[PDB]
Design an enzyme around this catalytic site. Structure first.
Site: not given
Length: 129
Positions: A46, A35, A101, A48, A50, A59, A52
């Protein structure tokens, strides 16, 4: 901070990640390697809008607030900049909430594509743990 492999493994172990929700330490070290290349200051934007953040590339759409992801959520209740610290506590505490989650470590694309189903114990071999 750019961590060494064994240095990060020991830091993650101290913070309770080894076997957290059934994921052995090697999984977490492997995920951090692909990562962020073990760099706490890693950021990636990203499509969209957003971003990271940090050693586990957490995110801003769901997990932290960076002030520029409209309609996003802040489930770890932290500014995203806290995830860039040389102290990995905030990243680890947030990662524990992510992995709990329901989707496990599949939340990390690099883990799913480059660690899942590999010999992840290799990532902690030779380390004094």
């Amino acid at each position: 901070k750019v961590f060494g492999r064994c240095e990060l493994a020991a830091a993650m172990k101290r913070h309770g990640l080894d076997n957290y929700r059934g994921y052995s330490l090697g999984n977490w070290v492997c995920a951090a390697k692909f990562e962020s290349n073990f760099n706490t200051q890693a950021t990636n934007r990203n499509t969209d809008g957003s971003t990271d953040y940090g050693i586990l590339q957490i995110n801003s759409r769901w997990w932290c607030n960076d002030g520029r992801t409209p309609g996003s959520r802040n489930l770890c209740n932290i500014p995203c900049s806290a995830l860039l610290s040389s102290d990995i506590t905030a990243s680890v505490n947030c990662a524990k909430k992510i992995v709990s989650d329901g989707n496990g470590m599949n939340a990390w694309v690099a883990w799913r594509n480059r660690c899942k189903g590999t010999d992840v114990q290799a990532w902690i071999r030779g380390c004094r743990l």
